[PDB]
């Protein structure tokens, strides 16, 4: 089993409830009976690796990847992580998962940009914020290993907090390639195995309409791995 | 042998020239006939350990551990590097040093803040921009291994570009201590080794002095480590 992406990424801020649920991270299989099985790692990290905190906010659902609060992360519990961070502003905070060092294939890092503020006014967020992460993802599927469900396209936070925004999603510049995003589902899946000898690389086109409809898109990359080696393609 | 520590960082801008001096890491035994050997991964990395591209600048020497760079980044070396950092705002780079995954005590992570523009003139700098990093570094030493020159204060850059301000450093709240900083020394070292069971942590006060003198001061903190353990300890 491998993530299909090495990195995710979401915001923090003071005083959001328990309850909130933040993102999904997803395995994609190497053999078809594989199944996952998600856990965090023990600790909060900080500024260059720095270890900050036993994790006593974030947990992960074991079989569907859904990462949530379980507690809230109000001033005092901001304050904890700051001063553990070695003397560095506190603006980012990861977790490890692992889905059986971390690195991909076998462990992915959540990254939280922290925000010392309270979520925002739902009236204040622009499409663009509404739609997509800050920075748009990019994929990881390995040629040649079973097809599966490899992304989920809305924002978790503002779903959430924001559930009279309505926001749908649909792929663009996929017709005979193997990626489905189905009517009305948020899921992104593979349809068939890939293989890098027919295509590399696939850049398709992720288009979210909100709501007096505005729509955003922003590009959908897919980078083919070898079915066996672990170590990171550049990307372009 | 370990690193004295597991991160270090300076800065670096567009433009700077080949055969400038950037900073120093450090070794220090685990047994008394232990010598170092230093050497860099093969890349530099970006944000959320986006692997970048072959290190064509950085070099380091083998023996002394100086890190140095062997060719100017001038702005298309810093658009090669933003264009491949995945989306994100290309703000911090880093190397892995190391000494014989990069995870202390075999491995350290330089990183480096890029800032586009020109390094600054010398007349703008402050006493504390011109004495430490930053963020005041914090030091790993071993319980029950032998003492050794684990710091070098001055900063490189800045005695490089800089000349002709005078820097000088000294240790405040040492004596007795295992610590050494000898008059016109830029390096710090232990005297004897260290034991857990008479001290865990050591924070002594590093002092710069500018120039007309003017002195800016920073802790310095000291954790003492296990023989054994390469747990990272927090950090208050």
Redesign the interface.
């Known amino acids: 089993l491998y993530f299909s992406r090495?990195?995710y990424?979401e915001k923090l801020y003071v005083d959001q409830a328990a309850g909130t649920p933040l993102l999904y991270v997803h395995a994609l299989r190497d053999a078809p009976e594989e199944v996952p099985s998600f856990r965090l790692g023990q600790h909060l990290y900080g500024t260059?690796?720095?270890?900050l905190?036993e994790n006593n906010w974030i947990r992960i659902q074991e079989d569907t990847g859904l990462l949530y609060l379980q507690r809230s992360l109000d001033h005092s519990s901001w304050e904890k992580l700051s001063?553990?961070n070695?003397?560095?502003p506190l603006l980012t905070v990861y977790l490890k998962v692992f889905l059986s060092?971390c690195?991909w294939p076998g462990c992915a890092?959540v990254?939280f940009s922290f925000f010392n503020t309270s979520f925002p006014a739902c009236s204040s967020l622009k499409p663009r914020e509404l739609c997509f992460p800050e920075?748009?993802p990019?994929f990881r599927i390995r040629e040649n290993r079973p097809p599966g469900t490899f992304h989920q396209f809305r924002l978790l936070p503002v779903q959430f907090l924001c559930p009279q925004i309505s926001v749908a999603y649909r792929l663009l510049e996929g017709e005979g390639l193997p990626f489905r995003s189905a009517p009305d589902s948020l899921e992104v899946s593979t349809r068939w195995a890939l293989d890098r000898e027919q295509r590399e690389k696939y850049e398709l086109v992720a288009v979210c309409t909100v709501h007096r409809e505005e729509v955003v898109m922003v590009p959908f990359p897919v980078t083919v791995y070898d079915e066996d080696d672990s170590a990171?393609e550049?990307?372009?």
Do not use: I, K, L, M
């Open positions: 090495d990195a990424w260059y690796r720095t270890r905190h001063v553990r070695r003397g560095f060092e690195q890092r990254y920075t748009r990019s990171p550049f990307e372009n």
